[PDB]
Amino acid sequence: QGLGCDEMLQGFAVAVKMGATKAD
């Protein structure tokens, strides 16, 4: 995996959970 549909989605889930940018 890298940054497809689920990987990019996880980048937003971790970013919104951390609170820094679009992907954290």
Look at the block and give the residue holding tokens 């989605």: 9
> What gap in Å lies between CA 16 and CA 9, rounded to an integer?
11
Nearest CA-CA partner of 24 in 4, 15, 9? 15
Residue 6 structure tokens: 């689920």
Could you tell me if 10 and 18 are in contact, meaning their C-beta atoms sit under 8 angstroms apart? no
Residue 13 structure tokens: 């889930």
Residue 5 structure tokens: 């549909």
Beta strands of the chain (E only): which ranges?
A: none
Could you tell me if 21 and 15 are in contact, meaning their C-beta atoms sit under 8 angstroms apart? yes
Experimental method: NMR
> What gap in Å lies between CA 13 and CA 23, rounded to an integer?
8
